[PDB]
C-alpha positions as protocol buffer text, in pm:
chain_id: "A"
residue {
  index: 1
  type: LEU
  ca { x: 1991 y: -2995 z: -498 }
}
residue {
  index: 2
  type: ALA
  ca { x: 2249 y: -2724 z: -550 }
}
residue {
  index: 3
  type: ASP
  ca { x: 2024 y: -2564 z: -805 }
}
residue {
  index: 4
  type: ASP
  ca { x: 1711 y: -2568 z: -584 }
}
residue {
  index: 5
  type: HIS
  ca { x: 1773 y: -2237 z: -418 }
}
residue {
  index: 6
  type: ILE
  ca { x: 1606 y: -1906 z: -513 }
}
residue {
  index: 7
  type: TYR
  ca { x: 1683 y: -1545 z: -421 }
}
residue {
  index: 8
  type: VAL
  ca { x: 1393 y: -1309 z: -347 }
}
residue {
  index: 9
  type: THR
  ca { x: 1434 y: -939 z: -276 }
}
residue {
  index: 10
  type: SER
  ca { x: 1287 y: -784 z: 35 }
}
residue {
  index: 11
  type: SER
  ca { x: 1317 y: -469 z: 244 }
}
residue {
  index: 12
  type: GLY
  ca { x: 1399 y: -514 z: 611 }
}
residue {
  index: 13
  type: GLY
  ca { x: 1267 y: -510 z: 964 }
}
residue {
  index: 14
  type: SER
  ca { x: 930 y: -658 z: 1050 }
}
residue {
  index: 15
  type: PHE
  ca { x: 813 y: -682 z: 688 }
}
residue {
  index: 16
  type: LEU
  ca { x: 1111 y: -899 z: 591 }
}
residue {
  index: 17
  type: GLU
  ca { x: 1087 y: -1110 z: 907 }
}
residue {
  index: 18
  type: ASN
  ca { x: 725 y: -1180 z: 826 }
}
residue {
  index: 19
  type: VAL
  ca { x: 789 y: -1263 z: 462 }
}
residue {
  index: 20
  type: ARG
  ca { x: 1047 y: -1514 z: 590 }
}
residue {
  index: 21
  type: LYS
  ca { x: 815 y: -1657 z: 855 }
}
residue {
  index: 22
  type: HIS
  ca { x: 495 y: -1673 z: 651 }
}
residue {
  index: 23
  type: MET
  ca { x: 609 y: -1711 z: 291 }
}
residue {
  index: 24
  type: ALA
  ca { x: 974 y: -1821 z: 257 }
}
residue {
  index: 25
  type: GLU
  ca { x: 990 y: -2079 z: 539 }
}
residue {
  index: 26
  type: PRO
  ca { x: 656 y: -2256 z: 467 }
}
residue {
  index: 27
  type: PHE
  ca { x: 742 y: -2270 z: 97 }
}
residue {
  index: 28
  type: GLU
  ca { x: 1084 y: -2423 z: 165 }
}
residue {
  index: 29
  type: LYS
  ca { x: 912 y: -2686 z: 378 }
}
residue {
  index: 30
  type: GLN
  ca { x: 657 y: -2783 z: 115 }
}
residue {
  index: 31
  type: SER
  ca { x: 878 y: -2755 z: -192 }
}
residue {
  index: 32
  type: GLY
  ca { x: 1226 y: -2839 z: -68 }
}
residue {
  index: 33
  type: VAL
  ca { x: 1341 y: -2520 z: -239 }
}
residue {
  index: 34
  type: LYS
  ca { x: 1564 y: -2296 z: -31 }
}
residue {
  index: 35
  type: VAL
  ca { x: 1472 y: -1927 z: -23 }
}
residue {
  index: 36
  type: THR
  ca { x: 1711 y: -1645 z: 58 }
}
residue {
  index: 37
  type: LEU
  ca { x: 1553 y: -1306 z: 126 }
}
residue {
  index: 38
  type: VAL
  ca { x: 1789 y: -1026 z: 20 }
}
residue {
  index: 39
  type: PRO
  ca { x: 1741 y: -702 z: 220 }
}
residue {
  index: 40
  type: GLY
  ca { x: 1768 y: -371 z: 35 }
}
residue {
  index: 41
  type: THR
  ca { x: 1601 y: -49 z: -79 }
}
residue {
  index: 42
  type: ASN
  ca { x: 1360 y: -38 z: -371 }
}
residue {
  index: 43
  type: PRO
  ca { x: 1592 y: 175 z: -592 }
}
residue {
  index: 44
  type: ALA
  ca { x: 1899 y: -41 z: -518 }
}
residue {
  index: 45
  type: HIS
  ca { x: 1723 y: -369 z: -593 }
}
residue {
  index: 46
  type: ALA
  ca { x: 1577 y: -232 z: -917 }
}
residue {
  index: 47
  type: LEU
  ca { x: 1907 y: -86 z: -1038 }
}
residue {
  index: 48
  type: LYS
  ca { x: 2086 y: -411 z: -957 }
}
residue {
  index: 49
  type: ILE
  ca { x: 1833 y: -607 z: -1162 }
}
residue {
  index: 50
  type: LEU
  ca { x: 1844 y: -342 z: -1435 }
}
residue {
  index: 51
  type: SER
  ca { x: 2225 y: -356 z: -1448 }
}
residue {
  index: 52
  type: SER
  ca { x: 2246 y: -733 z: -1454 }
}
residue {
  index: 53
  type: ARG
  ca { x: 2417 y: -920 z: -1735 }
}
residue {
  index: 54
  type: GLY
  ca { x: 2405 y: -1296 z: -1783 }
}
residue {
  index: 55
  type: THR
  ca { x: 2276 y: -1481 z: -1478 }
}
residue {
  index: 56
  type: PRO
  ca { x: 2063 y: -1244 z: -1266 }
}
residue {
  index: 57
  type: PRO
  ca { x: 2144 y: -1225 z: -894 }
}
residue {
  index: 58
  type: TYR
  ca { x: 1775 y: -1248 z: -804 }
}
residue {
  index: 59
  type: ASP
  ca { x: 1495 y: -1481 z: -915 }
}
residue {
  index: 60
  type: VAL
  ca { x: 1198 y: -1293 z: -767 }
}
residue {
  index: 61
  type: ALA
  ca { x: 1162 y: -916 z: -772 }
}
residue {
  index: 62
  type: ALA
  ca { x: 961 y: -807 z: -472 }
}
residue {
  index: 63
  type: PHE
  ca { x: 955 y: -437 z: -387 }
}
residue {
  index: 64
  type: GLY
  ca { x: 791 y: -95 z: -432 }
}
residue {
  index: 65
  type: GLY
  ca { x: 577 y: 4 z: -729 }
}
residue {
  index: 66
  type: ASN
  ca { x: 775 y: 308 z: -848 }
}
residue {
  index: 67
  type: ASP
  ca { x: 1099 y: 118 z: -895 }
}
residue {
  index: 68
  type: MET
  ca { x: 920 y: -195 z: -1015 }
}
residue {
  index: 69
  type: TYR
  ca { x: 773 y: 19 z: -1290 }
}
residue {
  index: 70
  type: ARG
  ca { x: 1134 y: 76 z: -1399 }
}
residue {
  index: 71
  type: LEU
  ca { x: 1179 y: -296 z: -1457 }
}
residue {
  index: 72
  type: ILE
  ca { x: 849 y: -309 z: -1642 }
}
residue {
  index: 73
  type: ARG
  ca { x: 965 y: -34 z: -1877 }
}
residue {
  index: 74
  type: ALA
  ca { x: 1299 y: -213 z: -1931 }
}
residue {
  index: 75
  type: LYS
  ca { x: 1144 y: -557 z: -1999 }
}
residue {
  index: 76
  type: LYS
  ca { x: 1320 y: -731 z: -1708 }
}
residue {
  index: 77
  type: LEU
  ca { x: 1024 y: -933 z: -1579 }
}
residue {
  index: 78
  type: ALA
  ca { x: 887 y: -1261 z: -1714 }
}
residue {
  index: 79
  type: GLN
  ca { x: 527 y: -1301 z: -1827 }
}
residue {
  index: 80
  type: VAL
  ca { x: 302 y: -1478 z: -1578 }
}
residue {
  index: 81
  type: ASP
  ca { x: -61 y: -1589 z: -1586 }
}
residue {
  index: 82
  type: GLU
  ca { x: -314 y: -1834 z: -1444 }
}
residue {
  index: 83
  type: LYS
  ca { x: -152 y: -2123 z: -1635 }
}
residue {
  index: 84
  type: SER
  ca { x: 195 y: -2071 z: -1488 }
}
residue {
  index: 85
  type: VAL
  ca { x: 87 y: -1916 z: -1156 }
}
residue {
  index: 86
  type: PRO
  ca { x: -258 y: -2060 z: -1071 }
}
residue {
  index: 87
  type: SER
  ca { x: -304 y: -1826 z: -771 }
}
residue {
  index: 88
  type: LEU
  ca { x: -336 y: -1533 z: -1014 }
}
residue {
  index: 89
  type: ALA
  ca { x: -687 y: -1661 z: -1090 }
}
residue {
  index: 90
  type: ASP
  ca { x: -786 y: -1561 z: -735 }
}
residue {
  index: 91
  type: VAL
  ca { x: -633 y: -1214 z: -750 }
}
residue {
  index: 92
  type: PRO
  ca { x: -863 y: -934 z: -872 }
}
residue {
  index: 93
  type: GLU
  ca { x: -747 y: -755 z: -1189 }
}
residue {
  index: 94
  type: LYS
  ca { x: -681 y: -423 z: -1015 }
}
residue {
  index: 95
  type: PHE
  ca { x: -383 y: -573 z: -828 }
}
residue {
  index: 96
  type: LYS
  ca { x: -234 y: -680 z: -1160 }
}
residue {
  index: 97
  type: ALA
  ca { x: -343 y: -395 z: -1388 }
}
residue {
  index: 98
  type: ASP
  ca { x: -24 y: -186 z: -1382 }
}
residue {
  index: 99
  type: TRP
  ca { x: 219 y: -471 z: -1446 }
}
residue {
  index: 100
  type: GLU
  ca { x: 153 y: -567 z: -1808 }
}
residue {
  index: 101
  type: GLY
  ca { x: 100 y: -936 z: -1732 }
}
residue {
  index: 102
  type: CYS
  ca { x: 433 y: -960 z: -1553 }
}
residue {
  index: 103
  type: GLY
  ca { x: 338 y: -888 z: -1192 }
}
residue {
  index: 104
  type: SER
  ca { x: 97 y: -848 z: -901 }
}
residue {
  index: 105
  type: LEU
  ca { x: 71 y: -660 z: -574 }
}
residue {
  index: 106
  type: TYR
  ca { x: 119 y: -917 z: -296 }
}
residue {
  index: 107
  type: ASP
  ca { x: -44 y: -723 z: -14 }
}
residue {
  index: 108
  type: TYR
  ca { x: -228 y: -393 z: 22 }
}
residue {
  index: 109
  type: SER
  ca { x: -227 y: -131 z: 298 }
}
residue {
  index: 110
  type: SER
  ca { x: -508 y: 124 z: 290 }
}
residue {
  index: 111
  type: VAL
  ca { x: -530 y: 495 z: 358 }
}
residue {
  index: 112
  type: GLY
  ca { x: -858 y: 587 z: 521 }
}
residue {
  index: 113
  type: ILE
  ca { x: -953 y: 847 z: 781 }
}
residue {
  index: 114
  type: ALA
  ca { x: -815 y: 809 z: 1134 }
}
residue {
  index: 115
  type: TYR
  ca { x: -967 y: 1000 z: 1426 }
}
residue {
  index: 116
  type: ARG
  ca { x: -1022 y: 1036 z: 1802 }
}
residue {
  index: 117
  type: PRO
  ca { x: -1380 y: 944 z: 1898 }
}
residue {
  index: 118
  type: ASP
  ca { x: -1350 y: 1171 z: 2203 }
}
residue {
  index: 119
  type: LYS
  ca { x: -1304 y: 1468 z: 1972 }
}
residue {
  index: 120
  type: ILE
  ca { x: -1537 y: 1356 z: 1694 }
}
residue {
  index: 121
  type: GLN
  ca { x: -1817 y: 1131 z: 1810 }
}
residue {
  index: 122
  type: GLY
  ca { x: -1901 y: 884 z: 1536 }
}
residue {
  index: 123
  type: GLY
  ca { x: -1622 y: 1024 z: 1322 }
}
residue {
  index: 124
  type: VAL
  ca { x: -1698 y: 1074 z: 954 }
}
residue {
  index: 125
  type: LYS
  ca { x: -1811 y: 826 z: 686 }
}
residue {
  index: 126
  type: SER
  ca { x: -1649 y: 960 z: 370 }
}
residue {
  index: 127
  type: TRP
  ca { x: -1359 y: 1158 z: 226 }
}
residue {
  index: 128
  type: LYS
  ca { x: -1619 y: 1412 z: 118 }
}
residue {
  index: 129
  type: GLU
  ca { x: -1752 y: 1448 z: 474 }
}
residue {
  index: 130
  type: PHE
  ca { x: -1394 y: 1475 z: 604 }
}
residue {
  index: 131
  type: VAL
  ca { x: -1321 y: 1754 z: 355 }
}
residue {
  index: 132
  type: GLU
  ca { x: -1643 y: 1953 z: 392 }
}
residue {
  index: 133
  type: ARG
  ca { x: -1650 y: 1932 z: 772 }
}
residue {
  index: 134
  type: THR
  ca { x: -1283 y: 2038 z: 783 }
}
residue {
  index: 135
  type: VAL
  ca { x: -1356 y: 2339 z: 560 }
}
residue {
  index: 136
  type: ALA
  ca { x: -1663 y: 2432 z: 771 }
}
residue {
  index: 137
  type: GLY
  ca { x: -1425 y: 2451 z: 1067 }
}
residue {
  index: 138
  type: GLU
  ca { x: -1595 y: 2175 z: 1264 }
}
residue {
  index: 139
  type: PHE
  ca { x: -1264 y: 2017 z: 1368 }
}
residue {
  index: 140
  type: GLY
  ca { x: -1097 y: 2350 z: 1445 }
}
residue {
  index: 141
  type: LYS
  ca { x: -730 y: 2354 z: 1350 }
}
residue {
  index: 142
  type: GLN
  ca { x: -675 y: 1993 z: 1453 }
}
residue {
  index: 143
  type: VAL
  ca { x: -653 y: 1828 z: 1113 }
}
residue {
  index: 144
  type: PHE
  ca { x: -331 y: 1670 z: 982 }
}
residue {
  index: 145
  type: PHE
  ca { x: -251 y: 1565 z: 623 }
}
residue {
  index: 146
  type: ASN
  ca { x: 14 y: 1373 z: 425 }
}
residue {
  index: 147
  type: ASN
  ca { x: 312 y: 1585 z: 320 }
}
residue {
  index: 148
  type: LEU
  ca { x: 338 y: 1550 z: -60 }
}
residue {
  index: 149
  type: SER
  ca { x: 721 y: 1548 z: -63 }
}
residue {
  index: 150
  type: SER
  ca { x: 757 y: 1278 z: 202 }
}
residue {
  index: 151
  type: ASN
  ca { x: 663 y: 959 z: 17 }
}
residue {
  index: 152
  type: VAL
  ca { x: 379 y: 887 z: 260 }
}
residue {
  index: 153
  type: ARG
  ca { x: 109 y: 836 z: -7 }
}
residue {
  index: 154
  type: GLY
  ca { x: 16 y: 1204 z: -34 }
}
residue {
  index: 155
  type: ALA
  ca { x: -16 y: 1184 z: -411 }
}
residue {
  index: 156
  type: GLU
  ca { x: -262 y: 897 z: -366 }
}
residue {
  index: 157
  type: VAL
  ca { x: -495 y: 1077 z: -125 }
}
residue {
  index: 158
  type: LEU
  ca { x: -496 y: 1387 z: -348 }
}
residue {
  index: 159
  type: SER
  ca { x: -584 y: 1164 z: -644 }
}
residue {
  index: 160
  type: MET
  ca { x: -903 y: 1068 z: -459 }
}
residue {
  index: 161
  type: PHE
  ca { x: -978 y: 1438 z: -418 }
}
residue {
  index: 162
  type: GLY
  ca { x: -934 y: 1482 z: -794 }
}
residue {
  index: 163
  type: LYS
  ca { x: -1185 y: 1201 z: -853 }
}
residue {
  index: 164
  type: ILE
  ca { x: -1448 y: 1318 z: -602 }
}
residue {
  index: 165
  type: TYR
  ca { x: -1429 y: 1691 z: -680 }
}
residue {
  index: 166
  type: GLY
  ca { x: -1287 y: 1687 z: -1034 }
}
residue {
  index: 167
  type: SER
  ca { x: -1265 y: 1482 z: -1352 }
}
residue {
  index: 168
  type: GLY
  ca { x: -1067 y: 1193 z: -1202 }
}
residue {
  index: 169
  type: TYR
  ca { x: -738 y: 1078 z: -1049 }
}
residue {
  index: 170
  type: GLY
  ca { x: -537 y: 1296 z: -1287 }
}
residue {
  index: 171
  type: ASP
  ca { x: -714 y: 1623 z: -1208 }
}
residue {
  index: 172
  type: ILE
  ca { x: -436 y: 1780 z: -1006 }
}
residue {
  index: 173
  type: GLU
  ca { x: -593 y: 2129 z: -1009 }
}
residue {
  index: 174
  type: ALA
  ca { x: -908 y: 1996 z: -844 }
}
residue {
  index: 175
  type: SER
  ca { x: -694 y: 1789 z: -605 }
}
residue {
  index: 176
  type: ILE
  ca { x: -486 y: 2088 z: -498 }
}
residue {
  index: 177
  type: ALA
  ca { x: -789 y: 2319 z: -494 }
}
residue {
  index: 178
  type: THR
  ca { x: -960 y: 2082 z: -247 }
}
residue {
  index: 179
  type: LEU
  ca { x: -661 y: 2075 z: -13 }
}
residue {
  index: 180
  type: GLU
  ca { x: -627 y: 2451 z: -48 }
}
residue {
  index: 181
  type: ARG
  ca { x: -978 y: 2479 z: 99 }
}
residue {
  index: 182
  type: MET
  ca { x: -866 y: 2270 z: 397 }
}
residue {
  index: 183
  type: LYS
  ca { x: -527 y: 2437 z: 442 }
}
residue {
  index: 184
  type: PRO
  ca { x: -632 y: 2687 z: 715 }
}
residue {
  index: 185
  type: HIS
  ca { x: -740 y: 2400 z: 941 }
}
residue {
  index: 186
  type: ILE
  ca { x: -432 y: 2182 z: 895 }
}
residue {
  index: 187
  type: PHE
  ca { x: -175 y: 2213 z: 1172 }
}
residue {
  index: 188
  type: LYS
  ca { x: 73 y: 1958 z: 1035 }
}
residue {
  index: 189
  type: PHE
  ca { x: 172 y: 1806 z: 704 }
}
residue {
  index: 190
  type: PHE
  ca { x: 323 y: 1485 z: 835 }
}
residue {
  index: 191
  type: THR
  ca { x: 636 y: 1320 z: 702 }
}
residue {
  index: 192
  type: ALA
  ca { x: 631 y: 964 z: 840 }
}
residue {
  index: 193
  type: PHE
  ca { x: 396 y: 662 z: 831 }
}
residue {
  index: 194
  type: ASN
  ca { x: 375 y: 648 z: 1211 }
}
residue {
  index: 195
  type: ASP
  ca { x: 270 y: 1014 z: 1234 }
}
residue {
  index: 196
  type: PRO
  ca { x: -110 y: 980 z: 1225 }
}
residue {
  index: 197
  type: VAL
  ca { x: -109 y: 742 z: 1524 }
}
residue {
  index: 198
  type: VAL
  ca { x: 129 y: 964 z: 1726 }
}
residue {
  index: 199
  type: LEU
  ca { x: -57 y: 1285 z: 1640 }
}
residue {
  index: 200
  type: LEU
  ca { x: -389 y: 1123 z: 1736 }
}
residue {
  index: 201
  type: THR
  ca { x: -267 y: 949 z: 2054 }
}
residue {
  index: 202
  type: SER
  ca { x: -73 y: 1252 z: 2178 }
}
residue {
  index: 203
  type: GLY
  ca { x: -396 y: 1449 z: 2155 }
}
residue {
  index: 204
  type: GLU
  ca { x: -239 y: 1703 z: 1919 }
}
residue {
  index: 205
  type: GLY
  ca { x: -447 y: 1593 z: 1620 }
}
residue {
  index: 206
  type: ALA
  ca { x: -816 y: 1504 z: 1599 }
}
residue {
  index: 207
  type: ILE
  ca { x: -847 y: 1361 z: 1249 }
}
residue {
  index: 208
  type: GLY
  ca { x: -661 y: 1308 z: 922 }
}
residue {
  index: 209
  type: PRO
  ca { x: -554 y: 1037 z: 676 }
}
residue {
  index: 210
  type: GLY
  ca { x: -413 y: 720 z: 832 }
}
residue {
  index: 211
  type: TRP
  ca { x: -338 y: 356 z: 755 }
}
residue {
  index: 212
  type: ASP
  ca { x: -583 y: 80 z: 840 }
}
residue {
  index: 213
  type: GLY
  ca { x: -335 y: -165 z: 993 }
}
residue {
  index: 214
  type: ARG
  ca { x: -134 y: 93 z: 1184 }
}
residue {
  index: 215
  type: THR
  ca { x: -451 y: 248 z: 1324 }
}
residue {
  index: 216
  type: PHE
  ca { x: -596 y: -95 z: 1417 }
}
residue {
  index: 217
  type: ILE
  ca { x: -283 y: -173 z: 1620 }
}
residue {
  index: 218
  type: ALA
  ca { x: -315 y: 161 z: 1803 }
}
residue {
  index: 219
  type: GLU
  ca { x: -689 y: 108 z: 1850 }
}
residue {
  index: 220
  type: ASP
  ca { x: -620 y: -231 z: 2012 }
}
residue {
  index: 221
  type: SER
  ca { x: -336 y: -125 z: 2242 }
}
residue {
  index: 222
  type: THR
  ca { x: -529 y: 182 z: 2344 }
}
residue {
  index: 223
  type: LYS
  ca { x: -868 y: 19 z: 2401 }
}
residue {
  index: 224
  type: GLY
  ca { x: -1042 y: 230 z: 2135 }
}
residue {
  index: 225
  type: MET
  ca { x: -888 y: 576 z: 2179 }
}
residue {
  index: 226
  type: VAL
  ca { x: -833 y: 598 z: 1803 }
}
residue {
  index: 227
  type: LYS
  ca { x: -1042 y: 454 z: 1521 }
}
residue {
  index: 228
  type: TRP
  ca { x: -1017 y: 415 z: 1144 }
}
residue {
  index: 229
  type: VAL
  ca { x: -1279 y: 496 z: 883 }
}
residue {
  index: 230
  type: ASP
  ca { x: -1331 y: 291 z: 570 }
}
residue {
  index: 231
  type: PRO
  ca { x: -1449 y: 584 z: 354 }
}
residue {
  index: 232
  type: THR
  ca { x: -1765 y: 526 z: 147 }
}
residue {
  index: 233
  type: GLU
  ca { x: -1584 y: 628 z: -175 }
}
residue {
  index: 234
  type: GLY
  ca { x: -1325 y: 363 z: -91 }
}
residue {
  index: 235
  type: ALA
  ca { x: -992 y: 359 z: 89 }
}
residue {
  index: 236
  type: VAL
  ca { x: -685 y: 433 z: -125 }
}
residue {
  index: 237
  type: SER
  ca { x: -455 y: 136 z: -119 }
}
residue {
  index: 238
  type: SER
  ca { x: -104 y: 56 z: -225 }
}
residue {
  index: 239
  type: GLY
  ca { x: 130 y: -238 z: -186 }
}
residue {
  index: 240
  type: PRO
  ca { x: 458 y: -400 z: -289 }
}
residue {
  index: 241
  type: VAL
  ca { x: 479 y: -583 z: -622 }
}
residue {
  index: 242
  type: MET
  ca { x: 599 y: -935 z: -694 }
}
residue {
  index: 243
  type: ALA
  ca { x: 743 y: -1049 z: -1027 }
}
residue {
  index: 244
  type: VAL
  ca { x: 957 y: -1320 z: -1186 }
}
residue {
  index: 245
  type: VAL
  ca { x: 1300 y: -1196 z: -1305 }
}
residue {
  index: 246
  type: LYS
  ca { x: 1370 y: -1282 z: -1671 }
}
residue {
  index: 247
  type: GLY
  ca { x: 1657 y: -1530 z: -1702 }
}
residue {
  index: 248
  type: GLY
  ca { x: 1654 y: -1641 z: -1339 }
}
residue {
  index: 249
  type: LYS
  ca { x: 1529 y: -1979 z: -1214 }
}
residue {
  index: 250
  type: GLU
  ca { x: 1192 y: -1894 z: -1362 }
}
residue {
  index: 251
  type: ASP
  ca { x: 1004 y: -2215 z: -1281 }
}
residue {
  index: 252
  type: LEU
  ca { x: 1106 y: -2213 z: -915 }
}
residue {
  index: 253
  type: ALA
  ca { x: 1031 y: -1838 z: -902 }
}
residue {
  index: 254
  type: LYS
  ca { x: 682 y: -1894 z: -1047 }
}
residue {
  index: 255
  type: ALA
  ca { x: 636 y: -2170 z: -791 }
}
residue {
  index: 256
  type: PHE
  ca { x: 730 y: -1935 z: -508 }
}
residue {
  index: 257
  type: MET
  ca { x: 505 y: -1661 z: -646 }
}
residue {
  index: 258
  type: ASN
  ca { x: 220 y: -1911 z: -673 }
}
residue {
  index: 259
  type: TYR
  ca { x: 264 y: -2000 z: -307 }
}
residue {
  index: 260
  type: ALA
  ca { x: 304 y: -1638 z: -190 }
}
residue {
  index: 261
  type: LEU
  ca { x: -16 y: -1534 z: -363 }
}
residue {
  index: 262
  type: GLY
  ca { x: -197 y: -1847 z: -246 }
}
residue {
  index: 263
  type: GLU
  ca { x: -464 y: -1852 z: 23 }
}
residue {
  index: 264
  type: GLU
  ca { x: -253 y: -2004 z: 303 }
}
residue {
  index: 265
  type: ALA
  ca { x: 44 y: -1768 z: 277 }
}
residue {
  index: 266
  type: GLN
  ca { x: -170 y: -1463 z: 203 }
}
residue {
  index: 267
  type: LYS
  ca { x: -375 y: -1520 z: 516 }
}
residue {
  index: 268
  type: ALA
  ca { x: -75 y: -1594 z: 737 }
}
residue {
  index: 269
  type: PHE
  ca { x: 133 y: -1297 z: 617 }
}
residue {
  index: 270
  type: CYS
  ca { x: -150 y: -1042 z: 602 }
}
residue {
  index: 271
  type: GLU
  ca { x: -296 y: -1133 z: 942 }
}
residue {
  index: 272
  type: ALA
  ca { x: 50 y: -1097 z: 1098 }
}
residue {
  index: 273
  type: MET
  ca { x: 113 y: -758 z: 935 }
}
residue {
  index: 274
  type: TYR
  ca { x: -244 y: -619 z: 952 }
}
residue {
  index: 275
  type: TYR
  ca { x: -248 y: -599 z: 571 }
}
residue {
  index: 276
  type: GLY
  ca { x: -516 y: -682 z: 317 }
}
residue {
  index: 277
  type: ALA
  ca { x: -467 y: -996 z: 106 }
}
residue {
  index: 278
  type: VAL
  ca { x: -481 y: -977 z: -273 }
}
residue {
  index: 279
  type: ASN
  ca { x: -622 y: -1331 z: -289 }
}
residue {
  index: 280
  type: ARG
  ca { x: -1003 y: -1307 z: -277 }
}
residue {
  index: 281
  type: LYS
  ca { x: -1028 y: -1652 z: -114 }
}
residue {
  index: 282
  type: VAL
  ca { x: -874 y: -1533 z: 214 }
}
residue {
  index: 283
  type: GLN
  ca { x: -1116 y: -1522 z: 510 }
}
residue {
  index: 284
  type: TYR
  ca { x: -997 y: -1325 z: 810 }
}
residue {
  index: 285
  type: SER
  ca { x: -986 y: -1394 z: 1181 }
}
residue {
  index: 286
  type: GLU
  ca { x: -1197 y: -1196 z: 1425 }
}
residue {
  index: 287
  type: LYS
  ca { x: -910 y: -951 z: 1468 }
}
residue {
  index: 288
  type: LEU
  ca { x: -953 y: -812 z: 1116 }
}
residue {
  index: 289
  type: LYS
  ca { x: -1273 y: -956 z: 966 }
}
residue {
  index: 290
  type: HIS
  ca { x: -1487 y: -665 z: 1081 }
}
residue {
  index: 291
  type: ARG
  ca { x: -1256 y: -371 z: 1005 }
}
residue {
  index: 292
  type: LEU
  ca { x: -1016 y: -447 z: 720 }
}
residue {
  index: 293
  type: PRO
  ca { x: -1153 y: -274 z: 408 }
}
residue {
  index: 294
  type: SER
  ca { x: -1301 y: -516 z: 154 }
}
residue {
  index: 295
  type: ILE
  ca { x: -1077 y: -640 z: -126 }
}
residue {
  index: 296
  type: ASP
  ca { x: -1351 y: -535 z: -369 }
}
residue {
  index: 297
  type: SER
  ca { x: -1394 y: -183 z: -232 }
}
residue {
  index: 298
  type: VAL
  ca { x: -1038 y: -46 z: -211 }
}
residue {
  index: 299
  type: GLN
  ca { x: -916 y: 197 z: -477 }
}
residue {
  index: 300
  type: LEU
  ca { x: -577 y: 180 z: -646 }
}
residue {
  index: 301
  type: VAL
  ca { x: -436 y: 469 z: -845 }
}
residue {
  index: 302
  type: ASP
  ca { x: -254 y: 404 z: -1175 }
}
residue {
  index: 303
  type: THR
  ca { x: 120 y: 385 z: -1105 }
}
residue {
  index: 304
  type: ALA
  ca { x: 210 y: 536 z: -1445 }
}
residue {
  index: 305
  type: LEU
  ca { x: -33 y: 821 z: -1383 }
}
residue {
  index: 306
  type: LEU
  ca { x: 119 y: 903 z: -1042 }
}
residue {
  index: 307
  type: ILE
  ca { x: 472 y: 907 z: -1186 }
}
residue {
  index: 308
  type: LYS
  ca { x: 372 y: 1117 z: -1484 }
}
residue {
  index: 309
  type: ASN
  ca { x: 187 y: 1380 z: -1282 }
}
residue {
  index: 310
  type: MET
  ca { x: 424 y: 1408 z: -985 }
}
residue {
  index: 311
  type: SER
  ca { x: 629 y: 1704 z: -1114 }
}
residue {
  index: 312
  type: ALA
  ca { x: 325 y: 1917 z: -1201 }
}
residue {
  index: 313
  type: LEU
  ca { x: 151 y: 1814 z: -877 }
}
residue {
  index: 314
  type: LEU
  ca { x: 455 y: 1922 z: -674 }
}
residue {
  index: 315
  type: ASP
  ca { x: 465 y: 2253 z: -861 }
}
residue {
  index: 316
  type: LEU
  ca { x: 97 y: 2324 z: -785 }
}
residue {
  index: 317
  type: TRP
  ca { x: 156 y: 2219 z: -424 }
}
residue {
  index: 318
  type: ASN
  ca { x: 454 y: 2454 z: -382 }
}
residue {
  index: 319
  type: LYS
  ca { x: 238 y: 2726 z: -534 }
}
residue {
  index: 320
  type: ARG
  ca { x: -83 y: 2689 z: -349 }
}
residue {
  index: 321
  type: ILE
  ca { x: -3 y: 2476 z: -37 }
}
residue {
  index: 322
  type: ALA
  ca { x: 346 y: 2524 z: 100 }
}
């Protein structure tokens, strides 16, 4: 009994409350295994796990991709597969690809194009249309864009530009060159996740990159004043990673991970948070069914690639953008 207790990292606020409500609590009920969610930042959790000697403080590593990649590089995560974590069979490979058989994204949020229909009737259908219409001056100077230095998925959006206009996600010249074309029409490089909704709803901005869930919430509360585009090339999606910590209570941890990635918990958590589920079995309520981008369509950029190119990308940015 005393040993049937696992520790699982988490962040804070609404995310953590919803992990508790939709993953930790239901699991405890079905398994009899107590779950403690430990609030903290990505870097702090990772360093703590990195630094650990003997019995690890945490059994399940659940946090951001950048810092999780640290634990991957340092061999701190246990191997998992469809034998040990059956739910992994229902998770498409792209959500697992970066983690060397030791992890999976456990939700995804998606950057698409958010806009005001009263400024842009019918909006746009693609990143390419967004770019070319911006450059043609059709939106005036009412476009906003992710600030690269602000950790608001700027690198990710630019990667899509590299792919559409260049040789792929790693073509930072093409990425920067695209944005450089748009620069005259951009009035704000935003620095927070909530910025697209505020810029749009205040009337200051007409269009720019925004998150599906966040925009859906605004669309609902505002009776359609803002809308989100699932771009034809695909939305660019990211999410937190879940992994079993080597040397922890690995069997209980795998059991929790199996539940968290399972259809029931994925649906409950993702519906509550307006996120996309990484389990392909999940079927959505009417609130999301028609607008959440398809699990098969969303694009994920290689974590290792983003980390490797960040310095050069920033340099080019500082040279040609800011």
